[PDB]
């Protein structure tokens, strides 16, 4: 009924009404980082 990763965490499932296999991938997330020249030099920024 369920799948597992090596670190013993769920990563796939049986859909219980149509028995095809669904991979569960975690929702996209991460750090937000602001690239900037010195605020004395310019007021512009770029975002990673």
């Amino acid at each position: 009924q369920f799948g597992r990763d090596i670190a013993d965490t769920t990563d796939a499932v049986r859909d219980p009404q149509t028995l095809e296999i669904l991979d569960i991938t975690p929702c996209s997330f991460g750090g937000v980082s602001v690239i900037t020249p010195g605020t004395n030099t310019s007021n512009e920024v770029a975002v990673l």
Binding site: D5, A7, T9, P26
Partner: peptide, 22 residues
């Protein structure tokens, strides 16, 4: 460097081969 490839040398390839939630 072995340029036929990443410009790794032959011995660097052996080293790169031999090594090896959210």
């Amino acid at each position: 460097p072995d340029p036929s490839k990443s410009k790794r040398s032959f011995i660097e390839d052996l080293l790169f081969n031999k090594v090896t939630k959210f």
